[PDB]
Each structure stands twice: as C-alpha cells, then as structure tokens.
Amino acid sequence: NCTFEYVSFKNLREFVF
Amino acid sequence: EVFNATRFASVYAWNRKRISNCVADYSVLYNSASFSTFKCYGVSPTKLN
C-alpha cells in the first residue's frame, strides 16, 4: 500500500521533525 | 508509462497504478485523436486541471 516513494566523532548532524 | 507501453494486462488481471506527487496537463488527451471513446462521468473533463 505504497502512496509515496522518493529516491535521492567529527560530524555533528542536528535534525528536527 | 501508462500509455506508451508495448503490452497491457488482461481485463480480469487489470493493472492498477497508484499515482501521487506528479503533474499532468491532461491536454494531450484532448489533442490525441486516436482515442475511440472518451467518457468522463464524475467531473467535467474541461475543468479538471
């Protein structure tokens, strides 16, 4: 039942959802 | 991809394509004179874009 599909310690990555 | 195909499925095993996040103008369907029957029932085909 797929409705959507998209295909495209020194590193600090900050995300917000 | 639904139209320019070299083969289609059967009537009982009909192919079902779910479409989302696309952009279609639906003017080629009007310009295409190869269609035998063009029957729209739900909404007027003119004001569907």
From Swiss-Prot, chain B:
Full protein stretch here: 340 to 388 of 1273
Effect on the protein upon substituting residue 32 to L: In strain: Omicron/BA.1
Name of the protein in question: Spike protein S1
Species annotation: Severe acute respiratory syndrome coronavirus 2
Effect of mutating residue 34 to P: In strain: Omicron/BA.1, Omicron/BA.2, Omicron/BA.2.12.1, Omicron/BA.2.75, Omicron/BA.4, Omicron/BA.5, Omicron/BQ.1.1, Omicron/XBB.1.5, Omicron/EG.5.1
Effect of residue 37 to A: In strain: Omicron/BA.2, Omicron/BA.2.12.1, Omicron/BA.4, Omicron/BA.5, Omicron/BQ.1.1, Omicron/XBB.1.5, Omicron/EG.5.1
Residues carrying covalently attached carbohydrate according to the record: 4
Taxonomic placement: Viruses, Riboviria, Orthornavirae, Pisuviricota, Pisoniviricetes
Effect of residue 32 to F: In strain: Omicron/BA.2, Omicron/BA.2.12.1, Omicron/BA.2.75, Omicron/BA.4, Omicron/BA.5, Omicron/BQ.1.1, Omicron/XBB.1.5, Omicron/EG.5.1
Role played: Attaches the virion to the cell membrane by interacting with host receptor, initiating the infection. The major receptor is host ACE2. When S2/S2' has been cleaved, binding to the receptor triggers direct fusion at the cell membrane. When S2/S2' has not been cleaved, binding to the receptor results in internalization of the virus by endocytosis using host TFRC and GRM2 and leading to fusion of the virion membrane with the host endosomal membrane. Alternatively, may use NRP1/NRP2 and integrin as entry receptors.
UniProt-reported outcome of changing residue 4 to Q: Reduced viral infectivity
UniProt-reported outcome of changing residue 36 to F: In strain: Omicron/BA.1, Omicron/BA.2, Omicron/BA.2.12.1, Omicron/BA.2.75, Omicron/BA.4, Omicron/BA.5, Omicron/BQ.1.1, Omicron/XBB.1.5, Omicron/EG.5.1
Quaternary data: Binds to host ACE2. RBD also interacts with the N-linked glycan on 'Asn-90' of ACE2. Cleavage of S generates a polybasic C-terminal sequence on S1 that binds to host Neuropilin-1 (NRP1) and Neuropilin-2 (NRP2) receptors. Interacts with host integrin alpha-5/beta-1 (ITGA5:ITGB1) and with ACE2 in complex with integrin alpha-5/beta-1 (ITGA5:ITGB1). May interact via cytoplasmic c-terminus with M protein. May interact (via N-terminus) with host bilirubin and biliverdin, thereby preventing antibody binding to the SARS-CoV-2 spike NTD via an allosteric mechanism.
Domain of life: Viruses
